Symmetry: C4
Subunit: 308 residues, 4 copies
């Protein structure tokens, strides 16, 4: 009997990953076979310029469980992962790196946690360890800032390695976004979520790129950087009128030219800052409208059918 349904999906983005495919697939077949469930391996060749696609073709010819999504260009690891998740049909979707930095044997624990009733199972590293002190401090500050300014609780030490149930995968597909912060998106779609500790196996930064990623994470879920300027401009304006009133009082109790210039410069700056703050409020509203996030995400229903 052919089940014709897939219980587990493994999404693996590739970029120049020859001489690693054999080890990858050997370890995965060693791990995914004792689970005794139907599975599929979605290898997303993300615009590699070397002999990576051909070995994927050779593997897929021999093995039915391997499926290949060949992106036209190099779109980036996150976009390749999103494409693989879009083309995955299993009940649970588990991203995996080609170099096998994250252990595959944690798939057993991920599946057990999922079967316990969780919809998201994060695979969080126990300790950063090999990361440099500068990287650790920057990551900690970034996560604290994300927690403070946003209403979203992104778990620490989380990578792409995780398990998403079919509900979460459908909800993520329900988010049309081009500037996506995947960590914040997964934490935004809040189902019953849990984490499993794992110690990265041994022997495993363009800070401009990390800064850009952090900027995307800040901007996609917080509008406060667009709201502060109204209050700052109002404060500066109020200080300007206070200074002008004090100068008038001094004149009656003449104003030097530099004092009048102070007053006018501060007032104009405050008015312009108020204008920028109002425009920033409207621009944040436009962003929230344009991102086209669903108003709500229903998890379970009693007595009703899921809306089209």
């Amino acid at each position: 009997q052919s089940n014709a349904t897939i219980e587990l999906s493994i999404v693996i983005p590739m970029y120049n990953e020859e001489d690693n495919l054999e080890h990858l697939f050997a370890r995965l077949l060693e791990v995914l076979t004792p689970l005794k469930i139907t599975y599929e391996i979605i290898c997303v060749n993300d615009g590699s310029k070397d002999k990576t696609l051909k070995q994927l073709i050779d593997c897929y010819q021999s093995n039915r469980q391997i499926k290949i999504v060949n992106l036209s260009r190099n779109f980036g690891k996150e976009i390749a992962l999103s494409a693989g998740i879009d083309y995955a049909q299993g009940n649970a979707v588990i991203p995996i790196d080609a170099d096998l930095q994250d252990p595959p044997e944690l798939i057993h624990e991920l599946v057990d946690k999922w079967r316990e009733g969780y919809d998201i199972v994060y695979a969080t590293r126990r300790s950063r360890q090999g990361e440099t002190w500068v990287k650790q401090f920057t990551a900690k500050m970034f996560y604290k800032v994300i927690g403070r300014m946003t209403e979203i609780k992104i778990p620490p030490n989380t990578g792409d390695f995780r398990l998403m149930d079919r509900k979460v995968v459908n909800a993520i597909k329900q988010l049309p976004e081009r500037t996506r912060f995947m960590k914040g998106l997964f934490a935004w779609v809040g189902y019953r979520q849990t984490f499993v500790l794992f110690d990265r196996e041994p022997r495993f930064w363009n800070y401009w790129k990390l800064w850009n990623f952090a900027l995307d994470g800040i901007f996609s879920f917080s509008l406060l950087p667009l709201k502060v300027w109204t209050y700052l401009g109002s404060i500066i304006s109020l200080l300007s009128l206070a200074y002008a009133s004090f100068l008038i009082l001094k004149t009656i109790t003449d104003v030097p030219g530099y004092a009048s210039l102070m007053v006018a410069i501060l007032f104009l700056g405050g008015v312009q800052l108020i204008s920028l703050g109002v425009i920033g409020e409207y621009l944040g509203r436009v962003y929230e409208e344009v991102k086209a996030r669903p108003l709500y995400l229903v998890s379970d229903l009693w007595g009703l059918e899921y809306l089209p």
Copy 2:
């Protein structure tokens, strides 16, 4: 004979509402039964972290009229209400609070008013009463400002407790919005509307949250905060040229350095304010386009079929 049609829908958002469900449902069954019409109770469990969903399951197992929409996360009372209204199928939809702050026996008067021919029946409190003087003054000022700057007439003392006919519910579903001011939206979709006075039963503010809600209400229906800055910048620029011309006249009838600095600062500030005003005009246009409100909402038709 099974009617297979629902005449009244009650949408109730929940958040940590145990030990209140029994009283809620007892009072509702006491009120909704003498109406002698088919009804349904849409309980929208809005991401409660305590034993609220389980009691809803127990109630729904015993009672067919109770339907549960379990949101994945805590999306907020307004979003839970919107989800319940989306999942309601009755001719009239009546939001209800779990704590029963608003009397359920007003549902009879709401239904009578609806049967009199109205499409929206507001349930307005006769007098704020227990509200503090600061809250009363802030609410009054907010409503006067809303009336002045917008073309929309939001009735005073209105909460979520109200009746929406199927026409109004469909029209509200026809408004794709993520930054929604529900009061302003309901007043924007203008059908035959009326109000019923009720005195809240006895024993029934994070001013930052109220300020944010007021800001959303101001920004979603008025663009004047984006239009003022053009006029302000033009006025400031005109004052700058007036001052410069007066200084030139004084020179011919030398200009001190502070006077030239005044002229240049004022002119640059006015030009920048004009630029900000033009950008604000275009941004307000972008907001109105992006909010994707329908051009018109047809209420009744003679001799024609409703367009797809």
Copy 3:
């Protein structure tokens, strides 16, 4: 034999138009009957607060050719006209005012011009005449500005009275816009268009509203108000460096404090203006993208079928 096709559609928006419906329909029946073609009258009751809808019901009960679209609220004359055009099914659509300011007997000339092969037939007044000199000057300046800054040639002295063929009506329905300048939209959708002169029959301004309408017309079809500021800021910056270099030359061939303040203020203003200009460019691009105008509008095809 029932044709089951409508050859001409008359769209008439109404707002407090009692005691004029009888004269309206008498004149229309006097005009539309000698044409010997099937027609329909779409009366769009635009949220009138008096006894206008009831007389429309009485007329529609007696006459099959009268169809009523009753808007829920007062959306404005332009929006009511758009709704009536959306609900019209004739080959040619002719807007008409309720007070009969524009003669109905011009419908004969409009139909003749349409049958000559034109897709848009404007009904332009021969001379403004009764309009005040201020109104004439403002209208002329507005039309000259529209012609200069836009690539669109809006014919002068054009009102809502006109004929749109089914091709033009479909193309206009293909323009999803909430901030619509109907004159500019009709001139933007450029088919074979012509005009017919007519002298308004005898006995037939909130300048803030006219200013807002003009602002919408300017902003919906021109982006130059968002492009100028880059050039202005660059010019101001270049002047600032020129002044600073001249001051340095004077020092070597000390700079007074006011001169350094001039230099810094001008440079900062120019840099901020360049930033505003770049943001305005991107905002104009966002507007053009968001307005969702079709890339092209195909008029006639040979050897191919019209794309879905």
Copy 4:
């Protein structure tokens, strides 16, 4: 046997092209016949005001392979090309100019390169030659700037003359854009692409229009002009506090009025520039979201079906 499938499509935009249609079609029939494949000629009459459409009708009546798309207005060469590509159904689409500036006999080499396995075959001029030195320098600088600021590698000396496979045509149709930079779009959709050298046959600038085209190309694929201003404002602010601290140190080791004015002006300018930079970041995000580019473009698939 009728193939009922088209192997090659030629898209030719027209604008006042009489007395050239006969030579055009003679040369094309001379070139496209030895290919021994089914073809079609899509002539997109782009709002010509002279006797161009009628000759196209006469040609299409005699020849079945000629198909005419008559645009309502003059939308521009790029938009007419896009419309023709939208209405083309061949496996390969080859844009062609009416004046035959680009040789038609290069279609043979384009087809050979396509049959070799490439999805895009650029037709690049070997040397600009007749172009003026100013034009050559401006084009070279523009292409270097495009390469530097964008991640996209637009090949040099490329015009509209090229071959797009059906995959690339479908991907381009998958890009809903109103402000389109076709060169950057084709380079953005990155398939297996190649180029063929050709020396333009003998006897074959409104710099404002070239500047606008360059501005569109810069703005549609780069957001850095919206990102720089945050860093510039932060630098200016830091300089302002440095100057203020140095002045305080000088006072303790009084500040002249011009020094305090320097400090305040620089600080306000830096704060406003930071606000403009944040707004520019959010506006670039809004642009990337609104342009509605697909997240990824899948080229080939193994073991899976193409998603709807």
